[PDB]
Amino acid sequence: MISGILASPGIAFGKALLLKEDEIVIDRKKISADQVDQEVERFLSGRAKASAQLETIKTKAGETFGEEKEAIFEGHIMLLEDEELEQEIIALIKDKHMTADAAAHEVIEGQASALEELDDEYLKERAADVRDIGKRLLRNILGLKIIDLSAIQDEVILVAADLTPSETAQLNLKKVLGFITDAGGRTSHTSIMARSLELPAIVGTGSVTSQVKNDDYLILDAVNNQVYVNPTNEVIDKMRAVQEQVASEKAELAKLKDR
């Protein structure tokens, strides 16, 4: 079947919520000196909103997990406000006649690749987290729609190949019944949420993200390390009784202490 790494015990039932994102496309058209002024406004002005959005998330990381994680997000903000990167990005637009989205991606292309050459869990993770900062800037300059994961109204299971610390830091723990992703690794941030929250979870799904679609009915067994896809009603009744029978057994244990 599908055997994952089992993060925490606990049976849960819910629909599959797949997170689908459209790839970002960069425009490589060369602009004229007349539109160059517009690129700087979108860039300088974009930082106005990006600095604010990233700044708000920074607090969520501290109010959600504690000051220990808040320091990591504070460092990312320093990169965006580095006066050094600003001069380089501005020069590329005016020197190479590149669009703000195009010039910005070039700088981000080397910042991420450079961090990958370091063999440290902190610096390496910074490579992936830094790339995320560039994606946020690109999404704001083009006015791309932003997915608000905190606006979920139906409790369901969250399924994704992997979540980045920023997305996990802003995830709403009250609207998600559990997490099931295909990132079985000690460095998987999703696994860390499960250990601190002890909520039932799995990460070594392997390739379930490539075999399930949003709205699929999934049962998390968190007992024998197996997930059921498209289970029959007869099978659902069998699993529903096992988890529920456990809750009733706890009440009976209180009466067995007097004999």
Swiss-Prot record:
Annotated catalytic residues: H189
Residues modified as Phosphotyrosine: Y122
Domain of life: Bacteria
UniProt modification remark: Phosphorylated on Tyr-122. Phosphorylation on Tyr-122 is important for polar localization but not for interaction with TmaR and for activity.
Annotated consequence of substituting Y122F: Is not detected in polar clusters. Is completely diffused throughout the cytoplasm. Does not affect function in sugar uptake or interaction with TmaR
Bilayer-crossing regions: none
Localisation per UniProt entry: Cytoplasm
Function: General (non sugar-specific) component of the phosphoenolpyruvate-dependent sugar phosphotransferase system (sugar PTS). This major carbohydrate active-transport system catalyzes the phosphorylation of incoming sugar substrates concomitantly with their translocation across the cell membrane. Enzyme I transfers the phosphoryl group from phosphoenolpyruvate (PEP) to the phosphoryl carrier protein (HPr). Can also use (Z)-3-fluoro-PEP (ZFPEP), (Z)-3-methyl-PEP (ZMePEP), (Z)-3-chloro-PEP (ZClPEP) and (E)-3-chloro-PEP (EClPEP) as alternative phosphoryl donors.
Other comment: The reaction takes place in three steps, mediated by a phosphocarrier histidine residue located on the surface of the central domain. The two first partial reactions are catalyzed at an active site located on the N-terminal domain, and the third partial reaction is catalyzed at an active site located on the C-terminal domain. For catalytic turnover, the central domain swivels from the concave surface of the N-terminal domain to that of the C-terminal domain.
Oligomer and partners: Homodimer. Interacts with the pole-localizer protein TmaR. Binding to TmaR is reversible as long as TmaR can get phosphorylated, whereas binding to non-phosphorylated TmaR is very strong and shifts the equilibrium toward binding.
Similarity comment: Belongs to the PEP-utilizing enzyme family.
Free-text comment about domains: The N-terminal domain contains the HPr binding site, the central domain the pyrophosphate/phosphate carrier histidine, and the C-terminal domain the pyruvate binding site.
Protein name as catalogued: Phosphoenolpyruvate-protein phosphotransferase
Originating species: Escherichia coli (strain K12)
The gene coding this protein: ptsI
